[PDB]
Design a protein around this ligand. Sequence first.
Ligand SMILES: Oc1c(Cl)cc(C(O)(C(F)(F)F)C(F)(F)F)cc1Cl
Length: 134
Amino acid sequence: SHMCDAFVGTWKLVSSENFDDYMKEVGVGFATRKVAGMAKPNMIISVNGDVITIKSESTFKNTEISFILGQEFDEVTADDRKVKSTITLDGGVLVHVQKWDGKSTTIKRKREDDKLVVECVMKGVTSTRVYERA
Ligand SMILES: Oc1c(Cl)cc(C(O)(C(F)(F)F)C(F)(F)F)cc1Cl
């Protein structure tokens, strides 16, 4: 048993709050915000050795990242930002920082009861997205 066991699996979005405002703060344009805000993604998390894979799949976009904790990688986001990403575990929370154009946003994933809670923060704007097991 190990580092991310309680995150592994297939998760489905069940609620969102403040996501349009988060996307605005990040710089996402109108049409992408509308279509992305409608999305109901599945988040699929797996681990093989030290490599964690996170897939996000919806009618809007299918994306996938694989990474080792603490080890930076280049990522193209679903909104076509080219970012430098680092994901770490901080007291049981997966913390994903994305850097681009002198900006930064942080996405935190936490297990809470039977949910996986995702908090997306850009400056003073936070969005909370709740996922349940599929
Ligand atoms: O699945 C998704 C993933 Cl991985 C990422 C996004 C975004 O890139 C966000 F919010 F992260 F900035 C954006 F901009 F399109 F909204 C949205 C969905 Cl729905």
